[PDB]
CSV table of C-alpha atoms and ligand atoms in Angstrom, one decimal:
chain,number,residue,atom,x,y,z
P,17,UNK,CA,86.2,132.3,20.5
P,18,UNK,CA,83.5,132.7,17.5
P,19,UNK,CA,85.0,134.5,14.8
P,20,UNK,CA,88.5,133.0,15.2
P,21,UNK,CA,88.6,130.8,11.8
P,22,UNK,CA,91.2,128.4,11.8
P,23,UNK,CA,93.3,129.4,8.7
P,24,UNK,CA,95.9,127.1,10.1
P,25,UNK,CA,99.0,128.7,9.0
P,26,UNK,CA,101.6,125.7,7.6
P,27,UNK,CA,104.4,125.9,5.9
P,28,UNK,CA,104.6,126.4,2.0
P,29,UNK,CA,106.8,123.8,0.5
P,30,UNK,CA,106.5,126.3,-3.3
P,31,UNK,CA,107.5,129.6,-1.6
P,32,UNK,CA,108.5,128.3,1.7
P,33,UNK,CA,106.4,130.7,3.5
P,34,UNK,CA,103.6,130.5,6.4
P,35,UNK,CA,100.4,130.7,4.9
P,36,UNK,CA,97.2,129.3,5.9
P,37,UNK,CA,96.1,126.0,4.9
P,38,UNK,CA,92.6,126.8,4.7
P,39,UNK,CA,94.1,129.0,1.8
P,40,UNK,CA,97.1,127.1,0.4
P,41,UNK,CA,95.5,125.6,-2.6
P,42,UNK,CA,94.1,129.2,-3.6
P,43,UNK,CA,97.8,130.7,-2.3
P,44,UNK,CA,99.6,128.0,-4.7
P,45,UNK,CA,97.5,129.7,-7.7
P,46,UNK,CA,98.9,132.7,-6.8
P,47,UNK,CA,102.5,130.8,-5.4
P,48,UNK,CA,103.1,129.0,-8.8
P,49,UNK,CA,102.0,131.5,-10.9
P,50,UNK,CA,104.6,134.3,-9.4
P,51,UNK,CA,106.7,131.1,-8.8
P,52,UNK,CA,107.8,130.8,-11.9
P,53,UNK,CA,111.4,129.6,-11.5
P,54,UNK,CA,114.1,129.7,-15.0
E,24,LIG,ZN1,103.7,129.7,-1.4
């Protein structure tokens, strides 16, 4: 292994979705902006 990045895929508590953690923060900008719940 070399170019195998460890995204680390967890699970979303705001969309409840497997997405990687090394991206989750950036994801929730995207998560909580579409994720807006009325
Ligand atoms: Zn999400």
């Amino acid at each position: 292994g070399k170019q195998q990045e460890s995204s680390q895929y967890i699970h979303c508590e705001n969309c409840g979705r497997d997405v990687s953690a090394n991206r989750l923060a950036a994801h929730l900008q995207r998560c909580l902006s579409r994720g807006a719940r009325r």
